[PDB]
Amino acid sequence: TPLQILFGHDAVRQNPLYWEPTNTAKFMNTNTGIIGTMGTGKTQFTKSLVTQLMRNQSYNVDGKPIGLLIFDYKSDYVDDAFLEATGAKRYQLSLLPYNPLSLFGDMPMLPRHTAMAFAETMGKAYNLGVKQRMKLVTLIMECYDLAGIVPHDRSTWNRVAPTIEDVWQQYLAQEKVDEDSLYAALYNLAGFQIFETDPEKMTSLYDLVDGVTVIELAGYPSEIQNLVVALTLDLFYAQMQKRGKPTVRGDYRQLTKMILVDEADNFMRQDFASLRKILKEGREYGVGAILSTQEITHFKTGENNYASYILTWVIHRVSEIRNSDIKAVFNIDDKSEQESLMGQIRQLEKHFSLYIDGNKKVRKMRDKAFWEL
């Protein structure tokens, strides 16, 4: 009865290789790195994983459904077959029906916590300076006030949140309207009406992720794309904290939601707070993250690197690799294996990968691709 995803088959033994994300003996967390350069069919693998998860959520602990949120940078998750097999809903970057400024949590000054994280996310996305970030928090607090939401009074926290449009309107209605990078970012963010403008039409993001949900980011500058991913993740994280812990029976933990970011390299480099929070804290809420990338490079970077939270790896071929990367991903100090792994990863063929399971066992693999399903 345990949820099994067929990743592929052993390169030599030919035996089926399974992923068991509910089984905490085999996998402590569901966090997953999928790596590959162009022409290695990694996206065909990622799609199999997702299609199977959607198909086999029946086997989830208590048979509970598994929400999957996919951030699709390159329009790779919207072919007819894939949407047919998953029943995936698609959202374009127009009037997204959720509101970054809506309130979740019970911390004191809750509205200010939300404004500050929003300002920090937007500051990172557009490289805004200290003063702009502060100004943004100030304008948002004024928008919360106009809406009867006030930081010292927690009884006002269930009222309808202002939206990004109200913040832009507030920017314009100032006595001194600076014509700077924040003005430009807001003019544009609001002009494209990326998020729903009507405070009343905002729905719950967390619940919006029922089944396979695709947010397609293609055709928008990387500032807006990254902003949408990070703001969606900030909001998601806040809701997830308030929804409780999954049912645990023996070695088996129920899976509630998964998040996928495909072409994650540039987003990861920006170091958005909420991604790290989800990778670290998702486990107890039944949430995991999958990061699909071209390079391995950006998994090792910084203290508490992304690698440090990822137990499952499916490494396809990569042009550029370093020793730092093998230490990061494989976690092996001896300089000789690093080289065979490196050259071996360099030699890997289309639809072949090095699968690292949750007990750190490496196995060359031939992927079960989506078309083969």
Side-chain angles (χ1 to χ4, degrees), residues 342-358:
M342 270 180 254
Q344 189 180 341
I345 290 161
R346 263 169 191 112
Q347 298 337 113
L348 274 172
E349 307 222 294
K350 191 161 189 265
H351 306 312
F352 285 86
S353 48
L354 302 185
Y355 171 41
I356 311 181
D357 64 24

Side-chain angles (χ1 to χ4, degrees), residues 213-276:
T213 306
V214 181
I215 294 179
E216 38 189 319
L217 304 164
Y220 287 84
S222 70
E223 287 76 32
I224 275 165
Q225 296 180 318
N226 287 359
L227 177 82
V228 168
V229 175
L231 290 175
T232 298
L233 295 187
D234 294 340
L235 187 60
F236 183 88
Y237 173 84
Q239 293 194 80
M240 171 200 77
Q241 298 237 251
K242 215 75 201 179
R243 285 289 192 119
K245 284 130 215 96
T247 75
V248 297
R249 300 185 298 180
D251 278 18
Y252 297 107
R253 180 198 253 96
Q254 185 208 144
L255 210 35
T256 60
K257 316 263 181 201
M258 296 282 287
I259 284 147
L260 166 69
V261 185
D262 196 314
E263 298 310 86
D265 302 83
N266 182 242
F267 182 86
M268 286 158 84
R269 284 172 75 154
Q270 293 222 257
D271 194 36
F272 291 103
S274 62
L275 175 58
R276 181 175 317 284

Side-chain angles (χ1 to χ4, degrees), residues 24 40 49 53 75 77 88 106 113 127 142 163 166 170 188 190 213 229 232 259 274 288-289 306 328 339 371:
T24 59
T40 74
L49 194 158
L53 249 184
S75 282
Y77 288 85
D106 52 351
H113 289 280
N127 193 47
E142 293 178 18
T163 65
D166 299 315
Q170 194 85 2
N188 198 57
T213 306
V229 175
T232 298
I259 284 147
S274 62
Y306 290 131
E339 294 291 359
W371 110 76

Side-chain angles (χ1 to χ4, degrees), residues 8 34 38 49 60 85 87 156 189 195 213 216 223 238 242 272 283 287 325 335 338 347:
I34 298 170
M38 291 252 91
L49 194 158
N60 191 25
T156 63
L189 181 60
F195 296 89
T213 306
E216 38 189 319
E223 287 76 32
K242 215 75 201 179
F272 291 103
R283 82 175 297 269
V287 180
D325 311 328
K335 299 174 183 172
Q338 311 204 150
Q347 298 337 113

